[PDB]
From a paper:
Despite all the progress made, information on the structure of full-length [name] (fl-[name]) and its conformational variability are lacking. Here, we report the crystal structures of a 207-residue [name] fragment, of fl-[name] alone and in complex with a therapeutic mAb MORAb-009, as well as the structure of its C-terminal shed-resistant peptide complexed with mAb 15B6. The structures of full-length mesothelin and its complex with the Fab of MORAb-009 reveal the interaction of the antibody with the complete epitope, which has not been reported previously. [name] has three predicted N-glycosylation sites at positions N388, N488, and N515. Glycan attachments have been identified in the structure for all three predicted N-glycosylation sites and confirmed with samples from cell culture and patient ascites. The N-terminal half of mesothelin is conformationally rigid, suitable for eliciting specific antibodies, whereas its C-terminal portion is more flexible. Our findings revealed the structural similarity of [name] to ARM/HEAT family proteins, which suggested its potential cellular functions, and shed new light on the conformational variability of [name].
The tumor-associated antigen mesothelin is expressed at high levels on the cell surface of many human cancers, while its expression in normal tissues is limited. The binding of mesothelin to the tumor-associated cancer antigen 125 (CA-125) can lead to heterotypic cell adhesion and tumor metastasis within the pleural and peritoneal cavities. Here, we report the crystal structures of mesothelin that reveal a compact, right-handed solenoid consisting of 24 short helices and connecting loops. These helices form a nine-layered spiral coil that resembles ARM/HEAT family proteins.
Residue numbers in the entry: 299 to 543
């Protein structure tokens, strides 16, 4: 059954291929043709095994990792992707990254997705704001999942993207690294514009900065009061504490 049956030699990727058997797709469908017209696959209602064949073709064609040409239109092939394979990928455009993450909506960060992001960010060089926006959209609890030392490398610019709900899972050792960045990030912003944004990062704020906030008529919430460093609220006086209330 090596040869493709006469007449079934597919010149184009189309809906006819759903009728084909596993070996027929392995015989008839050329890999080079599939790679070019990979944008059609998500349209065609293929079966489980049929996709495995299409996936196998790409490995044969691209032993050294797929190009971004193909990656963009992977779709539900991404689900059947090996972790080592993704390490080869050189993804750059964020529109690529969105499409991949949109196949695993709702679910937890799969091994594949985890390996994709680490490779993505290495390629960029730094964790961008635009990067964070997309990551936090699909996976809110990302920043807290990063190890404290990795957060040190994170530029102050990216803190714009972070939201109050994103830091819920963060332990205080992470907030100690994020606070000075947030402080550098939200600079030149006088008044309540300072306060409203820093609310969250106060969880890792020294005592010297708490005395500064007291005298600027902030009127801090009492919910925020509770989420402060126990060690770094000892030098601060009750007089100073009263000015935050
Ligand atoms: C990624 O880029 C490196 C350096 O240009 C190259 O050696 C490698 O083959 C690329 N990986 C891909 C796109 O398969």
């Amino acid at each position: 059954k090596t040869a493709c049956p006469s007449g079934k030699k597919a010149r184009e990727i189309d809906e006819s291929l759903i009728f084909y058997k596993k070996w027929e797709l392995e015989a008839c469908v050329d890999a080079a043709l599939l790679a070019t017209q990979m944008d059609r696959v998500n349209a065609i209602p293929f079966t489980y095994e049929q996709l495995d064949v299409l996936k196998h073709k790409l490995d044969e064609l691209y032993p050294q990792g797929y190009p971004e040409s193909v990656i963009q239109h992977l779709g539900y092939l991404f689900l059947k992707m090996s972790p080592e394979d993704i390490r080869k990928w050189n993804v750059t455009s964020l529109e690529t990254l969105k499409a991949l993450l949109e196949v695993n909506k709702g679910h937890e960060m799969s091994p594949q997705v985890a390996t994709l992001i680490d490779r993505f960010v290495k390629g960029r060089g730094q964790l961008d704001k635009d990067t964070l926006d997309t990551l936090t959209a699909f996976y809110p609890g990302y920043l807290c999942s990063l190890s404290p030392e990795e957060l040190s490398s994170v530029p102050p610019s990216s803190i714009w993207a972070v939201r109050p709900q994103d830091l819920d899972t963060c332990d205080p050792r992470q907030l100690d690294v994020l606070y000075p960045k947030a402080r550098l990030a939200f600079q030149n912003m006088n008044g309540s514009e300072y306060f409203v944004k820093i609310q969250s990062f106060l969880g890792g704020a020294p005592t010297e900065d708490l005395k500064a906030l007291s005298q600027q008529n902030v009127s801090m919430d009492l919910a925020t009061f509770m989420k402060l460093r126990t060690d770094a609220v000892l030098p601060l006086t009750v007089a100073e504490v009263q000015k935050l209330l």
